[PDB]
């Protein structure tokens, strides 16, 4: 029974740690900023060109 | 790339001066034109072909 509870606790620990450590949502900010910077670059560099 | 773009902006600010090529500035006692020293003093004379 302690092993079954340890199984549920193991799945819980794994899922919780995986969800908490990296949700992949943090990369969206750098992706947006990178995209905006990409637009600014593609504009200004060609303009100066 | 953005750094290169800013460098191109400064290069544009310098490109506003594009009308100046042969342009003469003042260096030492004399004034040189586009990097060519003109005139000669009693101390250090310049070359004839340079003038």
Give the integer Cα–Cα distance in Å for B42 and B28.
Answer: 14
Beta bridge partners of B32: B25, B37
Give the integer Cα–Cα distance in Å for B9 and B18.
Answer: 14
Task: Look at A48 and B8 and tell me if their CB atoms are within 8 Å.
Answer: yes
Give the integer Cα–Cα distance in Å for A32 and A37.
Answer: 8
Under 8 Å CB-to-CB from B11, ≥6 apart: which residues? Answer: A48
Asked if B34 contacts B24 with a C-beta cutoff of 8 angstroms, the reply is: yes
Give the integer Cα–Cα distance in Å for B12 and A48.
Answer: 8
- Write out chain A residues lying below 8 Å of B1, CB-based: 41, 45
Q: Please indicate the experimental technique that yielded this structure.
A: X-ray
Give the integer Cα–Cα distance in Å for A6 and A12.
Answer: 9
Axis crossing angle, helix A27-48 with helix B2-15, rounded to the nearest 10: 30
Give the integer Cα–Cα distance in Å for A24 and B15.
Answer: 45
Cβ–Cβ contact B2 with A under 8 A:
yes
Span between the terminal Cα atoms of chain B, in Å: 44
Give the integer Cα–Cα distance in Å for B28 and B39.
Answer: 11
Interface of B with A in 5-44 (CB under 8 A): 5, 8-9, 11-12
Handedness of CA B3, B6, B11, B12 (dihedral sign): positive
DSSP B33: E
Cβ–Cβ contact A39 with B under 8 A:
no
Q: How far is A24 from chain B (nearest CA, A)?
A: 26
Length of chain A: 49
């Amino acid at each position: 029974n302690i092993e079954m509870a340890q199984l549920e606790s193991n799945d819980t620990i794994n899922h919780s740690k995986t969800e908490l450590s990296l949700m992949s949502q943090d990369e969206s900010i750098n992706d947006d900023y990178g995209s905006i910077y990409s637009r600014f670059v593609q504009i200004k560099d060609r303009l100066d060109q | 790339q953005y750094e290169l773009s800013l460098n191109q902006l400064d290069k544009l600010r310098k490109i506003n001066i594009f009308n100046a090529t042969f342009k003469i500035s003042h260096s030492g006692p004399f004034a040189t034109i586009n990097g060519l020293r003109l005139g000669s003093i009693p101390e250090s004379v310049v070359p004839w072909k340079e003038i």
